Nucleic acid binder design. Structure first.
Lengths: 59, 47, 175, 119, 82, 137, 94
RNA sequence: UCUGGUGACUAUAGCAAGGAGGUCACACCUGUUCCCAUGCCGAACACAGAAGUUAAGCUCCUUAGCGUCGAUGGUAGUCGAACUUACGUUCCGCUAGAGUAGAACGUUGCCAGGC
RNA sequence: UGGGGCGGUCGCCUCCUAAAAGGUAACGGAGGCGCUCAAAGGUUCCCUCAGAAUGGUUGGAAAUCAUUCAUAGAGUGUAAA
RNA sequence: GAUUAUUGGAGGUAGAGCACUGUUUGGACGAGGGGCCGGUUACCGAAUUCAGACAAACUCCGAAUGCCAAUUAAUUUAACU
């Protein structure tokens, strides 16, 4: 957590439409369009991906 | 890089000597040391 | 600690049946990851290095740091100085909250057939992974990033070797 | 792969690199020190003969509370300073172990320094 | 003569009368030298100082004692009962 | 073969002629071999002629092992010129031996054949020698 | 394999040693389990006969004084040049 | 009679291996708000808790397996002497290295607990 | 100055010769010098080797990063010690 | 003062030795650039090994003898300014 060279991350609620895998983090300090409590009261801006929807193995 | 001669304020003589480097140290360096006129470590500067 | 209890259950389910650690005190945990970038050849690419810094500033919690070259190795312009590095130490809750993030953006843009990969290890429990920055910056899609780069990703585990890295990769990893 | 270890050996190595110019003459005896995790223990020692001069501890029941992690050692510094009032109540040789002039150390240090003894 | 060609490897130093100057048993002065050296073949021990050139001088007056130092090394002691 | 081909210095000292064999006094590679009875130098060339002779007598016969290399040079001035204004260039490379020190070994060929070949090698050689078997017992 | 020896004594000089080794004999020292560092000498000839009879190894009866000792070689100092022996070490197995 | 540092003994003191030990201390850790904290981590340091620990570390027990030292004897080498003319010979003493038997997997002083 | 001469050199430092104290010649053998560093100095407090593999976006092998061994071999302003 | 029994010590010769540096073998091992299709196979180079050898400017070792000094003891007769 290299203080001295540490910017701010934050455990953001990556609330996607594909299962809402809001257990991620980063500097994605975006507007909490979904001010939820079960996940972080932060950006759900992770809108659509295929990591939880269309895998090449289990699509 | 020359024979560097610092001039004290009022120790009155052309005493102290050292090395410098013009490339490393082109400007006038100054620092503390014993001028025995006064029994104390006092400042002198290049001149 | 999102994948924390996920791993804490898989150990007691799988490795307490295979490895059978005689005490909970001796349980196989991951330590950290080093996220050092690579060359980032800032002989005049000071700005490209600034950009690759700002990448990890936001991707990770800490930015890298520019290791000046210790040598003057020919076939490359470097010398005493020559900032040619980047280095980041992800240990704690950042490590986990970044882990769950990156494995959850990995397969979409990495375009991997296995799901992530099968292996690139060096035979210790350390991955020696090289990349092209596809899945990363899901915060900032590949629209304003200037240069492809791939870190030198190294697992750092209480486990013994890459064979056990696989067993723990069973948790939200696709080997 | 990488392993976690004990720090005390490093403490002791730094302590040895300290002890080179630093020894209990039996006039300014060496004030040897140890914190393990919970309680801090101390002993004034002659090193000209290698023999003790005192014995004190946090978990020594005389100076015993649940205060701070720190004021405990401060109390010990007062108590051992009183013990030194018997003899070796003078300026003596202090050992910072492989530790630093900070925290528990500095607290107990000034405790003993200002409870009589003028090292 | 006729053409005697030349050479170059004809250059060297003036030696420095190095090594010890006193021996195990004898008695000394305070400003006395015991060993001119380079580096530390032997380390000063008791009542000895290492000057500029690694020159060892017994601090005080007394007898000398060379001896080992560690498992495999050397030192010097000086004792003033005398 | 397995060597650092270079050297440290060129002009070195003329070694010790006297003495005894520090080793190399036993049969290891071959079965038969030759050791010596004198303690003199070798000029990189009697060896040459000798192994030539032994080979071309064997008709590309058995196997052969040399236990030697001139690690060492000598020098020489030109012809009988005045003295001491330097040190001359090298003229060849040598390797002194000792009585008892093995030189050559051979196998894959008859006893008497080897004996003959070695005898023949000796005649272009400057040293008294001796033919030897693989020591046993 | 029942060979005999004779006991060496102290300060066998260079002279008497060269004389004996030059004679048809050889010095030996035995040690190991069942024995001490005992210095004797032995006939080179019979030693070589039993060598050719037994091979490198053999638990040999050894006659010193009265006792027949089981022994084998520890090592030996042997001159290849002139192909004769100068010293023989022995180890007892008992 | 375990600990602590303190220890003086050279590692025959060890290396590695095998096994027991248990939060008297030991350390695993709880986190960083607190001093402090790191050209770049509560990593470390420091802070505050002891929650769970012998699993690690650690002590003890076993292997001399790795290492160590290491005989006896002997050799070369060498003083000296006398020889002769020798890439020397002989006599006298000093007697190495290497090898080799063999060994040991610790003695130990202080303190206050612990006993 | 192994006649003179031409050549070459002429002042210091380090090794070998130099013969287990030191010392010791050769138109004998090998290398450096005619400075530098106000930080490469002083003090205090931390850290601890390259190299090798170990191998991996680089990969010319190896740049950078990664784990274990590394005997200080690393490195230690300037020659060897 | 000198000599000798006795001590005690410094040191790295000779010898031995590869443990570094090297220099050298042989054979192996496997791989590499490469015989080719990026490779096979050989080839070398390098590493690794086995085993072996050499060293004034190599040393893990290490004599004899000499050197220095002791309350050194005995016998001599020096010794110094």
């Amino acid at each position: 957590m290299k203080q001295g060279i540490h910017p701010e991350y934050h455990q953001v609620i990556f609330l996607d439409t594909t299962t809402n895998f809001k257990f991620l983090s980063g500097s994605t300090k975006t507007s909490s369009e979904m001010m939820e409590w079960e996940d972080g009261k932060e950006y759900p801006v992770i809108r659509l991906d295929i990591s939880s929807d269309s895998h090449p193995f289990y699509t | 890089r020359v024979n560097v001669t610092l001039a004290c304020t009022e120790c009155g003589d052309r005493n102290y000597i050292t090395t410098k480097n013009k490339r490393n140290n082109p400007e006038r360096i100054e620092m503390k040391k014993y001028c025995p006129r006064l029994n104390k470590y006092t400042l002198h500067r290049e001149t | 600690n999102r994948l924390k209890e996920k791993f804490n259950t898989e150990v007691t389910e799988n490795l307490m049946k295979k490895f059978n650690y005689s005490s909970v005190m001796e349980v196989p945990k991951i330590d950290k990851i080093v996220v050092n970038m690579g060359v980032g050849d800032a002989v005049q690419n000071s700005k490209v290095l600034d950009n690759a810094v700002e990448e990890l500033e936001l991707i990770t919690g800490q930015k890298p740091l520019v290791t000046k070259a210790k040598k003057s190795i020919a076939t490359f312009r470097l010398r005493e100085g020559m900032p040619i590095g980047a280095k980041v130490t992800l240990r704690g809750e950042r490590m986990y909250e970044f882990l769950d993030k990156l494995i959850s953006v990995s397969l979409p843009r990495v375009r991997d057939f296995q799901g992530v990969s099968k292996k690139a290890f060096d035979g210790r429990g350390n991955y020696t992974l090289g990349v092209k920055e596809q899945l990363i910056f899901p915060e900032i899609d590949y629209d304003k990033v200037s240069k492809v780069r791939g870190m030198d990703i190294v697992i750092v585990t209480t486990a013994n070797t890459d064979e056990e890295a696989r067993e723990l990769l069973a948790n939200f990893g696709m080997p | 792969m990488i392993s976690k270890i004990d720090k005390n050996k490093v403490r002791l190595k730094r302590h040895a690199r300290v002890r080179t110019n630093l020894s209990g003459t039996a006039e300014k005896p060496r004030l040897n020190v140890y914190r393990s995790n919970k309680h801090i223990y101390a002993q004034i020692i002659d090193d000209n003969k290698g023999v003790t001069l005192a014995q004190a501890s946090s978990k020594d029941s005389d100076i015993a509370t649940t205060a701070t992690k720190v004021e405990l050692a401060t109390k010990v510094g007062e108590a051992i300073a009183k013990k030194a009032a018997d003899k070796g109540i003078k300026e003596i040789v202090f050992d910072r172990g492989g530790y630093l002039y900070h925290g528990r150390v500095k607290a107990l240090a000034e405790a003993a320094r200002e409870s009589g003894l003028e090292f | 003569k006729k053409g005697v060609s030349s050479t170059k490897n004809g250059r060297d130093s003036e030696s420095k009368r190095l090594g010890a100057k006193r021996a195990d048993g004898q008695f000394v002065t305070g400003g006395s030298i015991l060993y001119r050296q380079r580096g530390t073949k032997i380390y000063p021990g008791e009542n000895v100082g290492r000057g500029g050139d690694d020159t060892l001088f017994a601090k005080i007056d007394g007898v000398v004692k060379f001896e080992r130092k560690g498992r495999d090394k050397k030192q010097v002691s000086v004792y003033a009962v005398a | 073969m397995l060597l650092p081909k270079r050297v440290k210095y060129r002009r070195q000292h003329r070694p010790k002629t006297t003495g005894r064999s520090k080793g190399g006094n036993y049969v290891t590679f071959g079965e038969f071999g030759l050791q010596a009875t004198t303690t003199s130098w070798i000029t990189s060339r009697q060896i040459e002629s000798a192994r030539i002779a032994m080979t071309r007598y064997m008709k590309r016969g058995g196997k052969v092992w040399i236990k030697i290399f001139p690690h060492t040079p000598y020098t020489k001035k030109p012809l009988e010129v005045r003295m001491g204004a330097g040190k001359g260039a090298v003229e060849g490379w040598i390797a002194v031996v000792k009585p008892g020190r093995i030189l050559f070994e051979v196998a894959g060929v008859s006893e008497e054949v080897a004996r003959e070949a070695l005898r023949l090698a000796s005649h272009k050689l400057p040293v008294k020698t001796k033919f030897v078997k693989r020591e046993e017992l | 394999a029942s060979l005999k020896s004779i006991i060496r004594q102290g300060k066998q000089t260079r002279s008497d040693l060269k004389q004996l080794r030059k004679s048809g004999k050889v010095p030996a020292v035995v040690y190991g389990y069942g024995t001490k560092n005992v210095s004797v000498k032995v006939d080179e000839v019979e030693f070589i006969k039993v060598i050719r009879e037994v091979g490198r190894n053999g638990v040999i009866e050894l006659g010193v004084g009265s006792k027949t000792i089981k022994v084998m070689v520890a090592d030996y100092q042997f001159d290849p040049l002139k192909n004769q022996i100068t010293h023989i070490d022995f180890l007892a197995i008992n």
